[PDB]
RNA sequence: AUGCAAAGCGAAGAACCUUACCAGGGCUUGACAUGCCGCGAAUCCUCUUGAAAGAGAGGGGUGCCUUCGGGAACGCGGACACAGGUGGUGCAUGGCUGUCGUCAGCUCGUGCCGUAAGGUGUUGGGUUAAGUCCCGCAACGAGCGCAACCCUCGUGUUUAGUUGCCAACGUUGAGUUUGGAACCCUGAACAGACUGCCGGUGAUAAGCCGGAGGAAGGUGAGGAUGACGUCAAGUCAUCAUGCCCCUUAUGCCCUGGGCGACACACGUGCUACAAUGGCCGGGACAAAGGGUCGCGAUCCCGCGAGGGUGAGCUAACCCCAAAAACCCGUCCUCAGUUCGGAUUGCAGGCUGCAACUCGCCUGCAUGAAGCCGGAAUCGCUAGUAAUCGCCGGUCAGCAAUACGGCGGUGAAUU
């Protein structure tokens, strides 16, 4: 509704880089966005059947795609690399062919490497899948929001802010919840605040979480 | 003079460090090179409506800065071809080789 | 009045083929038509072409004075002031 | 935006690489006005095959949702979702503008 | 008045004669941003006036506009409920500005020939007592001094 | 030879002063030939030479590109005024008194979205 | 969508398509997804009837693996779950927006005050765009907002020079060639205004008013950025989602029509009522962007739109444009006019199956309303108002009248 500017969209020129950094000619630029969005929808969800399995349990932090000619970088930042890679080398093998069958035309030799994050309570993308995952299991809302505030402060941060929209605990009228601790400078560019947005399933309605994590100045 | 290379990207600290490498690694091979001379940027400006309905005001602005720069080598030697073809360092830059 | 005519006036294949089949020894006048983008060719003389306008097919006569017309300008698109049957008035 | 409407236009894209790939140049020789007085009607009259086929019948549509309006040739997306992609970080060189 | 003080807005002076107050007459007769042709309205009215008069074109300009320049005008101020027609005394800075506005309108409200004759006619008509230019000086004096009781003396 | 830049709006005009007769040559044409049809703004080009008295002693060559005819004329006036500083540093005080060394920062910029002519707001329906 | 925050508003482009609506002709696990079975590779050219959607049959043709049983890719048909919905509800909702507002406020910790709800700090005296700042004061500090940090514009400096420029020097006068990097420009960095300095005012504060030095000062001009929240304001026709409903159906395909229908009303714009203008001829300068199912010069032809041939540019090397006011001379010389173009007839060009309804543009002719317009009412303080040209996005086509973007000329008043 009447909120502040996107801290990932305001800080696009400096500090925080793009989730996809490449170059293409305006003739095959439209096909460049289609191939990068189709794989980002297939790696974030990552389920061939109609079940709630992989990718959403381990928590995806960032997906950086870099390309020049016929080769994509597709480096995924994960919290727990135990689910994506192996249980016996079969997990990353079916992911190597899934991205190959979709993107063809030219000889698309896709290499996918994996890197880790220091702590999952520093990045905004795990927090958007952790707190929103507590809405799926129907746990106490305001107790889960105050726990998401302290779990990031103990992970060494200078400020954190969390807020959703309406349809809380099965209420007919739409309300809003807001808890904040420390300082979060929403206007300044020398703040390097990261953002994420995730949707919830729910049989009564639909929720939408917004994460604001202030690192250094 | 002979071989002309065009370096196109979006962010400035990436190309200026990549084009400076094709000056330091091209002078130690054989002939002299003409320094990284930047030609004018083709900056585009277009608007789009934010709200999915009737709100003609509050229209935004998107910028796509295509920073282009040129660097020319005088004489194409055998040791210059073994350097520039193997030095495939671009992370988001595109190199167009012309004769 | 001058429309989009170059050299090809554009007359449909389902228009002329059905009229050339009737121009063998001259018989039958009533013919149904759906395409209003077609041009009138001088062999349509004496033949009553019923053209569609969305509602129904209106029986219009073709003479020698109407050559460079489209048959669509003959059939009224909507209801304005012209030739039409007097409708039965219900309750006001 | 609907899976029934995007499909109706995908069937209009499949005949573009069948009818308009090679046999379009067969009619393009006589539809235009030639420098000579002898311009044939036979091919312009028998021009019945392109019923559902037409290059002007093609609408770009959004690659994520699929709505016919406000499609930019550079991106290929519509003004609502094109915005959601640049407000995040999904496209290189799509920063904030001033002038 | 206290917060943000601006004196006046001035451009470049008169072409070759050098005067800043006469440069406001070329700026008020200015139609849609054409200062190149607005020069041809004032300087041709200076070339055609030397036959009608004897002295210098700067003198006959100042000796004539004194009959178009007002001393007191009416302003609308409300106090207590009723709108009072209180007359405030006009100075030399606003009085010279009000004189060239009524000489501008009187020139345009006379469709005869060109603007070179229309401005030259209303320049000498202010000295003898004719035209719509000199009539507005005596018309504002009919609104003033009749409502003299609403304003107290200095 | 003495150099001098001098800008106005988007009009740049490089002035190079030298000693000679006194003929002003702008873009391979004379001062009365390029700015033809007797423009009044041609007198402002010769003003920084009039207050010091150098027009009959100094000759000038100037290449003007960009802007309008009235925009180029004020670009020469600043170009000669900055060039009359390098020949003698003592000619700064009587020339800076008129305001010829100072650049006019006035520029007709961008037209803001939502509005027509930058500041002009669209009128809505009255009650 | 409709008080302001509706009314060229969502659709930056509706002749087919788009479209969702209407009429008519048709198909239903069915146009689109997965799974099972049968015949089968899949396709190309198909012929007939028909408005088309479609239906009946014709040859030509059949790759890659296996213990050949069988399969993947794809197709027709069959059975069943389902598929499908721009159907209702945004007073069930996510996301996003307008709005007051860029208004400047909105709060907290500790400590005090009151029984308490709360208050104090966020009051007061001045001062700024601003709880901006100073002083006073049980308030003392802090957080979000304001400011600043980021992007352009205005000065210079350093580095590097092509498709840029070119002073000095040899010129096919066209930088044109060698050559030169000085200057312009170009692209990254760096320096700079911080009321900082002087004086006056003011409570020997803040701040304001002037001045000095300076390209630039008092948030330099102007953007972006617009808090806690107000209107259960807008959008489930962008998408997503709860519920409900339809599911041989408000689902699906096609042809034609419709949305640019009218006695009227209202809003927002454009072109004029002229002669600071029109017209004829000559003629001086711009910035910013576009372009490979593209931008398209030169030449030839046509009164013209445009067409034929066709170079170059994938681009500060080619093209899109030869920018218009302005300016010199001439004509007219204020009569509804050598002002104005609405409308109309006739004849063409161009894009596309195709443009009668519905198009743009050209040529010829016709040539009104209208002489600045009631009550009421709108925007703008500088390079702004006003005005004059150009470019882009959308897009086959609806090219100066919509939106976005660029520059030329250049005020008034406070």
Swiss-Prot record, chain A:
Subunit field text: Component of the chloroplast small ribosomal subunit (SSU). Mature 70S chloroplast ribosomes of higher plants consist of a small (30S) and a large (50S) subunit. The 30S small subunit contains 1 molecule of ribosomal RNA (16S rRNA) and 24 different proteins. The 50S large subunit contains 3 rRNA molecules (23S, 5S and 4.5S rRNA) and 33 different proteins.
Plastid recorded as keyword: yes
Chief place where the protein resides: plastid
GO MF, one annotated term: rRNA binding
Domain (KH type-2) ranges: 47-118
Tagged with keyword Signal: no
Gene3D superfamilies membership: 3.30.300.20, Ribosomal protein S3, C-terminal domain
SUPFAM superfamilies for the chain: Prokaryotic type KH domain (KH-domain type II), Ribosomal protein S3 C-terminal domain
Record-level GO cellular component terms: chloroplast; cytosolic small ribosomal subunit
NCBIfam families: rpsC_bact
Record's signal peptide: none
Role description: Component of the chloroplast ribosome (chloro-ribosome), a dedicated translation machinery responsible for the synthesis of chloroplast genome-encoded proteins, including proteins of the transcription and translation machinery and components of the photosynthetic apparatus.
Localization per record: Plastid, Chloroplast
InterPro entries: KH_dom-like_a/b (IPR015946), KH_dom_type_2 (IPR004044), KH_sf_prok-type (IPR009019), Ribosomal_S3_C_sf (IPR036419), Ribosomal_uS3_bac-typ (IPR005704), Ribosomal_uS3_C (IPR001351), Ribosomal_uS3_CS (IPR018280)
Name of this chain's protein: Small ribosomal subunit protein uS3c
S-S bridge residues: none
GO biological process annotation, one example: translation
The family this protein is said to belong to: Belongs to the universal ribosomal protein uS3 family.
Gene name of the record: rps3
From Swiss-Prot, chain C:
Superkingdom of the source species: Eukaryota
InterPro entries: Ribosomal_uS19, Ribosomal_uS19_bac-type, Ribosomal_uS19_CS, Ribosomal_uS19_SF
Example GO molecular function: rRNA binding
Protein's UniProt keywords contain Membrane: no
Cited PROSITE patterns: RIBOSOMAL_S19
Disulfide feature: none
UniProt record similarity statement: Belongs to the universal ribosomal protein uS19 family.
Subunit annotation: Component of the chloroplast small ribosomal subunit (SSU). Mature 70S chloroplast ribosomes of higher plants consist of a small (30S) and a large (50S) subunit. The 30S small subunit contains 1 molecule of ribosomal RNA (16S rRNA) and 24 different proteins. The 50S large subunit contains 3 rRNA molecules (23S, 5S and 4.5S rRNA) and 33 different proteins. uS19c binds directly to 16S ribosomal RNA.
Protein name (database record): Small ribosomal subunit protein uS19c
Provenance organism: Spinacia oleracea (Spinach)
Lineage, top ranks: Eukaryota, Viridiplantae, Streptophyta, Embryophyta, Tracheophyta
Gene this protein is translated from: rps19
Curated annotation (Swiss-Prot), chain D:
Gene3D superfamilies, alphabetized: 1.10.287.1480
Keywords, alphabetical: Chloroplast, Plastid, Ribonucleoprotein, Ribosomal protein, RNA-binding, rRNA-binding
Listed GO CC annotations: chloroplast; small ribosomal subunit
One function term, GO molecular function aspect: structural constituent of ribosome
HAMAP family (alphabetical): Ribosomal_uS14_1
Main function: Component of the chloroplast ribosome (chloro-ribosome), a dedicated translation machinery responsible for the synthesis of chloroplast genome-encoded proteins, including proteins of the transcription and translation machinery and components of the photosynthetic apparatus.
Miscellaneous section: Two forms, which differ in pI, are produced, S14 alpha and S14 beta.
Name recorded for this polypeptide: Small ribosomal subunit protein uS14c
Organism phylogeny: Eukaryota, Viridiplantae, Streptophyta, Embryophyta, Tracheophyta
From Swiss-Prot, chain F:
One function term, GO molecular function aspect: RNA binding
Cellular localization per UniProt: Plastid, Chloroplast
Spans through the membrane: none
GO biological process, one term: translation
One cellular component term from this protein's GO annotations in UniProt: chloroplast
The keyword Iron-sulfur belongs to this UniProt entry's keyword annotation: no
Biased amino acid composition, Basic residues: 113-127
Keyword field: Acetylation, Chloroplast, Plastid, Ribonucleoprotein, Ribosomal protein, RNA-binding, rRNA-binding, Transit peptide
Region annotated Disordered, chain positions: 104-127
UniProt function note: Component of the chloroplast ribosome (chloro-ribosome), a dedicated translation machinery responsible for the synthesis of chloroplast genome-encoded proteins, including proteins of the transcription and translation machinery and components of the photosynthetic apparatus.
Family of the protein in this entry: Belongs to the universal ribosomal protein uS9 family.
Oligomer and partners: Component of the chloroplast small ribosomal subunit (SSU). Mature 70S chloroplast ribosomes of higher plants consist of a small (30S) and a large (50S) subunit. The 30S small subunit contains 1 molecule of ribosomal RNA (16S rRNA) and 24 different proteins. The 50S large subunit contains 3 rRNA molecules (23S, 5S and 4.5S rRNA) and 33 different proteins. uS9c binds directly to 16S ribosomal RNA. uS9c interacts with translation factor pY (PSRP1).
Name of the protein in its database record: Small ribosomal subunit protein uS9c
């Amino acid at each position: 509704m009447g909120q502040k500017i996107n801290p990932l969209g305001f800080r696009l020129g400096t500090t925080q880089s793009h989730y996809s950094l490449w170059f293409s000619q305006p003739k095959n630029y439209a096909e460049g966005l289609q191939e990068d969005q189709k794989i980002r929808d297939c790696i974030k969800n990552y389920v061939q059947k109609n079940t709630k399995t992989s990718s959403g349990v381990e928590g995806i932090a960032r997906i950086e795609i870099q390309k020049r000619i016929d080769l994509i970088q597709v480096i995924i930042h994960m919290g727990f690399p135990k689910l994506l890679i192996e249980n016996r080398p079969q997990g990353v093998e079916d992911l190597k062919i899934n991205v190959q069958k979709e993107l063809n035309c030219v000889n698309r030799k896709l290499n996918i490497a994996i890197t880790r994050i220091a702590k999952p309570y520093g990045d905004p993308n795990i927090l958007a899948e952790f707190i929103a995952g507590q809405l799926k299991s129907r746990v106490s809302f305001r107790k889960a929001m105050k726990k998401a505030i302290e779990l990031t402060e103990q992970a060494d941060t200078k400020g954190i802010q969390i807020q959703i929209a309406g349809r809380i605990d099965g209420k007919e009228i739409a309300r809003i919840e807001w808890i904040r601790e420390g300082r979060v400078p929403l206007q300044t560019i020398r703040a390097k605040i990261d953002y994420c947005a995730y949707t919830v399933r729910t049989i009564y309605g639909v929720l939408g979480i917004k994460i604001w994590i202030f690192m250094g100045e | 003079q002979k071989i002309r290379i065009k370096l196109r990207s979006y962010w400035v600290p990436l190309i200026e460090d990549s084009c400076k490498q094709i000056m330091d690694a091209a002078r130690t091979t054989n002939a002299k090179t003409m320094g990284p001379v930047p030609l004018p940027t083709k900056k585009r400006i277009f608007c789009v409506l934010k709200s999915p309905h009737v709100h003609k005001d509050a229209r935004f602005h998107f910028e796509i800065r295509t920073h282009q720069r040129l660097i020319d080598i005088l004489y194409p030697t055998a040791q210059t071809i073994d350097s520039l073809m193997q030095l495939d360092l671009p992370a988001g830059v595109d190199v167009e080789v012309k004769l | 009045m001058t429309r989009s005519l170059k050299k090809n006036p554009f007359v449909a294949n389902h228009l002329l083929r059905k009229i050339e089949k009737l121009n063998k020894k001259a018989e039958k006048e009533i013919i149904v038509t759906w395409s209003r983008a077609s041009t009138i060719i001088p062999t349509m003389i004496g033949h009553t072409i019923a053209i569609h306008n969305g509602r129904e097919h209106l029986p219009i006569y073709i003479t020698d004075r109407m050559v460079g017309h489209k048959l669509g300008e003959f059939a009224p698109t909507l209801n304005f002031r012209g030739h039409a049957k007097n409708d039965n008035k219900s309750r006001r | 935006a609907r899976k029934s409407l995007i499909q109706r236009e995908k069937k209009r894209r499949n005949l573009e690489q069948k009818y308009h790939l090679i046999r379009r140049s067969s009619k393009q020789e006589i539809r235009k006005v030639t420098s000579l007085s002898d311009k044939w009607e036979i091919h312009g009259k028998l021009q019945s095959p392109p019923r559902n086929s037409a290059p002007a019948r093609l609408h770009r549509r959004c690659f994520l949702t699929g709505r016919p309006r406000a499609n930019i040739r550079d991106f290929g997306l519509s003004g609502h979702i094109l915005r959601e992609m640049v407000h995040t970080c999904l496209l290189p060189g799509a920063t904030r503008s001033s002038w | 008045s206290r917060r943000g003080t601006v004196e006046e807005k001035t451009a470049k002076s008169d072409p070759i004669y050098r005067n800043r107050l006469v440069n406001m007459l070329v700026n008020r007769i200015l139609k849609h941003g054409k200062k190149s042709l607005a020069y041809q309205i004032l300087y041709r009215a200076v070339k055609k006036i030397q036959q009608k008069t004897e002295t210098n074109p700067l003198s006959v300009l100042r000796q004539a506009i004194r009959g178009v320049t007002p001393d007191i005008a009416v302003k609308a101020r409300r106090v207590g409920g009723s709108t009072h027609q209180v007359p405030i005394e006009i100075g030399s800075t606003q009085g010279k500005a009000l004189a060239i506005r009524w000489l501008l309108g009187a020139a345009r409200k006379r469709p005869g020939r060109n603007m070179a004759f229309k401005l030259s006619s209303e320049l000498v008509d202010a000295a003898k007592g004719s035209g719509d230019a000199v009539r507005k000086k005596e018309e504002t004096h009919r609104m003033a001094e009749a409502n003299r009781a609403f304003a107290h003396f200095r | 030879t003495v150099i001098g830049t001098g800008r106005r709006k988007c009009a740049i005009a490089r002035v190079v002063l030298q000693e000679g007769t006194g003929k002003f040559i702008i873009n391979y044409r004379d001062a009365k030939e390029y700015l033809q049809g007797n423009p009044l703004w041609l007198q402002y080009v010769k003003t920084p030479l009039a207050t010091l008295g150098y027009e009959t002693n100094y000759d000038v060559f100037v290449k003007a590109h960009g802007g309008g005819l009235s925009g180029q004329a004020q670009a020469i006036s600043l170009g000669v005024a900055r060039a009359l500083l390098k020949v003698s540093a003592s000619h700064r005080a009587p020339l800076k008194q008129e305001g010829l060394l100072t650049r006019d920062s006035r520029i007709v910029e961008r037209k803001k979205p939502g509005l027509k002519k930058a500041r002009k707001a669209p009128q809505f329906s009255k009650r």
